[PDB]
Symmetry: C3
Subunit: 121 residues, 3 copies
Amino acid sequence: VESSTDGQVVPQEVLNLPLEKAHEEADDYLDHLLDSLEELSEAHPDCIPDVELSHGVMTLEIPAFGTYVINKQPPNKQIWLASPLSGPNRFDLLNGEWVSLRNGTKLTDILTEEVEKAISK
Amino acid sequence: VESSTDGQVVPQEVLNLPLEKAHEEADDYLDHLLDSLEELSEAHPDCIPDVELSHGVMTLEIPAFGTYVINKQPPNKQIWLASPLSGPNRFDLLNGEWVSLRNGTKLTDILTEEVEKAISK
Amino acid sequence: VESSTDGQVVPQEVLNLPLEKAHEEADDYLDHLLDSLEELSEAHPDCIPDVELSHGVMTLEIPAFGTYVINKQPPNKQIWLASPLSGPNRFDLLNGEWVSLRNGTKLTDILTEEVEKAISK
């Protein structure tokens, strides 16, 4: 912070508030997904045995197709999908939902399709 | 730069031009805002006493509501708004203007609304 | 990776697959451009003598106008165009194509226009 400034704001009532860092919107998504997908992991006739979430990396075992990988990524566009079925994709917010850079389809919809394509068989 | 290359371009007439780094488009915005909002800071019946701009952090005192914070942020989407009234938001360029990732509304419009919501009282 | 975790996935059949890092979509573009623009560099009546590509920096000599520079850039929006004719611009993916943050026009189209504006004279 080289400007030789002596003191900007400290206009306390920013700093005397119940203050809080933001939460990566990608981080937010992966949580709403971890326990929404492990609440699906209940009604598997057998065939979605595991979801695990590391450090912004999510693995999803689905033996019917092979194993999904879902990632926090540096931009150029963020959130990464590696699907054993539909291939690789990446996603950024448009209007509150996560959308493919490729064609602009929701990954929320791509998971739905592919998860319930599995409940069938 | 490990490619063992000996010399690419130096096609001078890029380098013999009146040359210049770009300016962060967020940086550009915060300036057009600092002196547009301190030219509003004149016609306050009392109630917007201070704007200060550090190092891509802007504070705006508005005692009616509490204190605004406006930030340069690493992407996932850039420019950050912490409003004492409307809450937190983040914004990226769409077509030359700065737009909310949440719903795509202009922050240019959100400030307008909230600044002049204040001139009233 | 400080969580004291002992072992997440290793669900091999991610790791026993023919695996592969992704390729920057900007990197992809600059290649499809290097050899598409050096296949134009053939039918120059004289006037586009050189294209060179370093490390995600591309130079394009076009003596009629002066020299183009095309860059891989950290986001806030990515891929950078410095045109001797149309000025500076930056571009992000929308739906699989590279689009100006300023007004949303394709750079693919901006090069076309300016390259063939040159074949003429």
